[PDB]
Amino acid sequence: MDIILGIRVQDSVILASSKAVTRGISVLKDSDDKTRQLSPHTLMSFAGEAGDTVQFAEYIQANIQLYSIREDYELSPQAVSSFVRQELAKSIRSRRPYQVNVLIGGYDKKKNKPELYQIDYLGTKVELPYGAHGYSGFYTFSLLDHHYRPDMTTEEGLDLLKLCVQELEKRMPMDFKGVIVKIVDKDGIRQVDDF
Amino acid sequence: GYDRALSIFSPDGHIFQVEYALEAVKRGTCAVGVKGKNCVVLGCERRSTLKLQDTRITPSKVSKIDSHVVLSFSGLNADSRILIEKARVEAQSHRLTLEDPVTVEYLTRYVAGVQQRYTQSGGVRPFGVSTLIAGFDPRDDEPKLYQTEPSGIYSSWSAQTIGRNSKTVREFLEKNYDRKEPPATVEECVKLTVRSLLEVVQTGAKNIEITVVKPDSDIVALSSEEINQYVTQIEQEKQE
Amino acid sequence: GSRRYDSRTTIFSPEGRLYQVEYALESISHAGTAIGIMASDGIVLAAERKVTSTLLEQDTSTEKLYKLNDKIAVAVAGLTADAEILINTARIHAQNYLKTYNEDIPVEILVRRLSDIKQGYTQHGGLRPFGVSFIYAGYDDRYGYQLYTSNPSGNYTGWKAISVGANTSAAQTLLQMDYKDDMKVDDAIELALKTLSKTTDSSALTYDRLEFATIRKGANDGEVYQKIFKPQEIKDILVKTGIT
Amino acid sequence: NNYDGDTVTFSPTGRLFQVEYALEAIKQGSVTVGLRSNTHAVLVALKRNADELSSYQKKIIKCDEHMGLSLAGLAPDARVLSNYLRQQCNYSSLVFNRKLAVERAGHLLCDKAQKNTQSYGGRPYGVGLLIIGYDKSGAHLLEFQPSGNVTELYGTAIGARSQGAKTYLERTLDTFIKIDGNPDELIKAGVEAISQSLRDESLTVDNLSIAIVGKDTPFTIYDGEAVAKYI
Amino acid sequence: TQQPIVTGTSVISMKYDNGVIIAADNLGSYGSLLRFNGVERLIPVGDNTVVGISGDISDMQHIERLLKDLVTENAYDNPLADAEEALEPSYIFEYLATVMYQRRSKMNPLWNAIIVAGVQSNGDQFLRYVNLLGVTYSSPTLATGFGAHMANPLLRKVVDRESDIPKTTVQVAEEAIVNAMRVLYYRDARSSRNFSLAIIDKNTGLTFKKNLQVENMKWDFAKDIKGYGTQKI
Amino acid sequence: DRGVSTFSPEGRLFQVEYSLEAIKLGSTAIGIATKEGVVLGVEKRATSPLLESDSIEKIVEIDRHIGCAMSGLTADARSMIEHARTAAVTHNLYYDEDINVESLTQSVCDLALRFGELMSRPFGVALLIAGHDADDGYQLFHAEPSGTFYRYNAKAIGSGSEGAQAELLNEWHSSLTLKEAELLVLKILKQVMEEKLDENNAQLSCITKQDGFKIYDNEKTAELIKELKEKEAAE
Amino acid sequence: QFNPYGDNGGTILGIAGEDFAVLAGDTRNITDYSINSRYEPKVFDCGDNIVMSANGFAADGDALVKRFKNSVKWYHFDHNDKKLSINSAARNIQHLLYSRRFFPYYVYNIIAGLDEDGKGAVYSFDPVGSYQREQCRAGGAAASLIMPFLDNQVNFKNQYEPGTNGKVKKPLKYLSVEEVIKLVRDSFTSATERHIQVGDGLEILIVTKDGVRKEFYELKRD
Amino acid sequence: TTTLAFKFQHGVIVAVDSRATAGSYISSLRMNKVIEINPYLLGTMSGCAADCQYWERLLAKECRLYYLRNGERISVSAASKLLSNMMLQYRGMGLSMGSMICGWDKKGPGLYYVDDNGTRLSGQMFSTGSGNTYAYGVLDSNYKWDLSVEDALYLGKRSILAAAHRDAYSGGSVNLYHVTEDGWIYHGNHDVGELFWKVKEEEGSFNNVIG
């Protein structure tokens, strides 16, 4: 798929993901949710080749849910991101690699800190205050570099995110049909229904 | 590979290895399952021959297979871990391929199938384990309680017990459990479960574990003090 | 054919017991006693070497206490060779977990993995089980200090204080008597050595007949240190506690 | 005694008891007769029922347009062996555009049964077969034993009380061999032969099973009212 | 997948009233080089079949061995190996055709074009073609490579359809085959003067003729041909 | 010890013969074939009153035109049923038609002797396979762990089998109606069962060309039991 | 590089009548500009009153026919000599073709016979196993030449009733076997004139309740 | 091809064309592009005919087995996912399949788009094939949830007609289906030649065309 953004603020992580799905020259859907909840306080957004994205995301989701049940314990965002990275780094030298880029937004309940991890299809992991995949960063990073503070509120993070989406809507040739925004904090995961 | 047929028929038409696996279950600590009108309770015996135990980290007798289904057992402890692991894997595999969580009946059927497979496969012995599987199907408020055993047969029960002295507690449940009117509340269901274990347990201290499962993935384990209050109230009514 | 000579190591008795597991436990009951005691500020591992010689090189010797990683250690009772096979597998599992999740493996997860391997040898393959009982002493940030034991059946349980090997019946009674929940490491050290001193089949308990280890948060600030005691250090703690 | 636990063990007198026990399963089986002339070959089989409510177990199996057999003993083992024959007949046709010679079919069955008598873990086949066929060298009749021994004959019989039918065929040898170009008379001789092995029971309409193959006659099986003509 | 190295050119054949005739030259070419001059490309199987092979010679020698092994295997436990259960042309062909199609299906073909000529048990003439692709067809006249382009037209003037077969004698058929071999020598750059010819008759059996030569050739008119257009001397 | 595929001196496979003894200990199952349909009935035999009897599934659907009843070690039957269902539906995939009852039974029986040292022992369960197809009409088969199958007009398997089979010997005729067959299964089940027969400890089912395979409701069976009691009291 | 495929030309035609069916095909086999055979049968009686022709690459066509004939044989063995219905044969062939989805039988296949109600039936297949029951179907080299003619002369497409001027269609009256054979012969005679791979001979197989009958007709040999 | 399907108040409409091509040659005038999987489940076909037929008929086997094992009808969500997982096994191997799984289950009416890449999308309205763009134009401007069964059937029929007219690789005839909680209902084969002229006159559309 196309655009996935992520921003880590004071007490939460915000993920924004495009709604469009295109087959050939036709837009099949304009309400697609490019995300999976891995655990109550960990959310993963994804973008890449058709089909591969969801299979990979659902495969990761199943593994983390299995771990949660076995140990009756939620893995830290760091531990989950490392598991995901290894699966991708394993994949890149396979017969047919999974062509999926991900953002992992999670709230570490132990440390009481939000965490954002950016991982590409090669298995290249980086922890960031804000991140993006594909061409999304080309348009948005200049704004984030300028406006981002680490002590921002969730509301300030959403306003800065709106500005990023507006810039994308102005200068990108592709119509990505807006974004679904989700917030990850101490209380769990919730969707912003008006954006 | 080791292919030796260990589970075989005898002249009288018995598979002794499967029957000896039931003797391992008879040795295991008592486990009991009682379903109320809107809940299921799983009771489990803890033998007090082992003190100086760390109860925080010691493997609990009741295991969550998914957020809405639980599994308790009687028999070999090591064997039970293998069934639980397989069950947990299948639960996630079902969610992944069918997009619905398993029904309690389906999960039971799978675990029972694994047990059966180990009674006619070469080089392996049967599981020395009988299980009680309980929970609520997705978007359903009807309680479910199933039992499995080493042979691989399974069935649904209004109330059931397995393990050592299970003959005694089943005797108790058969005369005390009314089908026309099952334990209407959580309290009544837990009380009847604790009462049934008190026929066999010895001391009502740290020897009784209780786990209540309610609809919509609402599962909680009672603490020592909460159970101790049931133990106190039961005997005070008995002194009459 | 070959069937004639098969002992059938993975079968039930008429009473519902696993023959080979029971006989393996009988073997372990003749092994040197190993004790584990868990305190609020650390864990103690104490173990008795079996009838040694004066010509045994003790300072380079290791038969009882082994390191699995920086946070987890084990005391062995039974066949040492069997134990080393399992120990190396456990060390690998700990490193696999660390590589995958970038976090040190929780104690119970490591214990369960080893216990599952033991279980397999009792249910399939037609091989004899490992004649080994472990005491696991470890620390992680979820449950803190933990003691576990596993035996050839593949069953494992958690403990505040526990013994394996010879004279466990006597040893467990003595531990149950003097153990208290608010106990500290220095007290637990004394309890472990006193218990061995009373349960030992030897005439007297000396430094050359012991292996000793502690796991302490007695490491500079929020972190955990493993201390495998040297022969001279065991000799000192024996004098300190008033046994020699 | 001590040497009958498996097929891989000779007795002190050089006997293979598991093979002999498999041979015993044939003797318990229902009688079946085989005989031939120069133009046709005929199988006649007495089918057995479990009780009055039950059907009569089928005894004859078709292998190709020009070949088929009758069984006596473990019926599932006959299914395995007949399936193998079907495949071999079929391999000959597809690869070589050649109908499989009856003699070569016997050699293949012999070699398949033999492997089960020399290896540990397996067991001998518990069934005897009478193979009839018509190939480039005319009509043929074979007798298969699960020891591996295959024998080409003018006529024979296997199963319970088969000795009576075998003696009859031994007397009638010179007569029935000459029955050329007359299928009905050859079947009559087969029905009269199998009748020498009957006691208490007689040949009824759902009891009798007959098969025939010949010069211009594909292997066809007759059951039900199709054999009432011969009762 | 490979490429053919040492090759044999046309194989030609036709039916006549009592049997079949097949012929092929004795050359093994190595590209444009006429490397080997003593190669037999007609291979008899028993006294009722001749297999004529064109294409890769190393693959031909492989087939030659399969056929030799086929005869050995057919004789095993077969008292009628020299009678009723002897190898028929139709058996030998179907075997080869099975092999050729299997090899193409594994993308590792036998780089050949084969014609199986023979007479069946009932006296019927057998003539069928098979190649590296497993493609099979039958006709009163058959030819491979250049023979298909030049020989068939000449042989089809004798036997244009099925009804012409009983009207064609062995003398006429042999004459036509021999003429075709001369024409191929005139016009095929990978042919040779020396060839072999085989006749399988239902009465007189298998006649195998070796060391034949193309004769009665016309070259004399060449002396008059001068230049490429305007040149007179 | 001794081989699993060993022949006895009488020419029988020890393990197959011993599995037949396990089937004799199983609960009773009866099948009756008529020209209006085939009826299948079983004894549930709950080990305790707390066991919810409707969860005892000893009668099972294989296809719309084929049903199956079991007796013996009923856990062994699950893989047989799974194979049967797969065979039935797979044939429908390959040939766009219903599969013959005999062909289905033969496919199930092919598993039977796949044991040795494949599975480690024969099945410890017998099956009554009932169904309908266009070629041979209404059929009832008895599938054993020996790999043998007999067709039956009527058949009983399980602990009360020889007593029930003698009764089926006298009662069965070629002009039985479906209603008459239903009552006949109930009558014979009631005769051989330990406990008193009712709608909760016994189950009925049938297969007809029109409606296919149907397991009977407890309310429907209860009426047929009441109809049976009255007609036995009628003389 | 080795090319495992080839083109043997040829053209086939199947027409379903009210109580009969025909499957016709020319007898010419070719490669490039050469004739291999003037009479190489292409339509086969496969048993159970079914006829089949696999047109395209002859080696794959022969293999498929051989396997289906074999499938019929094993259907008898496995299912008590039951007759293989035309609809069942068609589904079986789909699975034969899809076994080689990734290395296809390079043939356009047609079968013909009678359905279980006794009416005429023709089924059509692509190389990878898509099939459908049809009334009329031409396959092979000259398929594009023949099909439009059959749309017009069998289903009366673009034909209306005089006087109405496009308002009332020509009614779809059934055709006799004699009428169908005329359309078949004229189809192949016309195809022979304009397609170089079509000629030599025409072999027709007619299927009725009485069995399978053959008819042969000469075609132009140029 | 052109295929479409959409959910509405009274279930789901399914409309497909019937043309099949082999290059520029029209190989088939009337091909069935719907598959009856079960009385409550339908599947459309676009792409490689063989792939569509084989895999969706194999889905029906697997949907049928689900019923026998569980004694209950499979959901549309689960059926679509089984199919998507099949496509995922032959990943990158060259399968060409675009299908909509239409049906009614316990959640109500269900519609899932599934293709060879493994994509599986839930939605109200979908259209696949070479002429989908033409169909979407009519659908998007005229679709409502409050449509009557009569008007909804016409919309899907009219939408295919729009595509059949413009797209050279779409046409032949229109096959209509209507899915209810009592199962699906076939609403006939409609020749485009006749339907076009009829719609032109009655609706007044296609003014630029002469007739």
Ligand SMILES: *[C@@](C)(CO)[C@](*)(O)[C@H](Cc1ccccc1)NC(=O)[C@H](Cc1ccc(OC)cc1)NC(=O)[C@H](C)NC(=O)CN1CCOCC1
């Ligand atoms: C319209 C007509 C687009 O052409 C549809 O998508 C239609 C859908 C359809 C679905 C089920 C049944 C019939 C029709 N598709 C076709 O008609 C399809 C077009 C197509 C061909 C090839 C493709 O890539 C593999 C994708 C789409 N046509 C066919 O499938 C035709 C009938 N058959 C073949 O193309 C078979 N090939 C196989 C290899 O050999 C050459 C011919």
Ligand SMILES: [Mg+2]
């Ligand atoms: Mg022409």
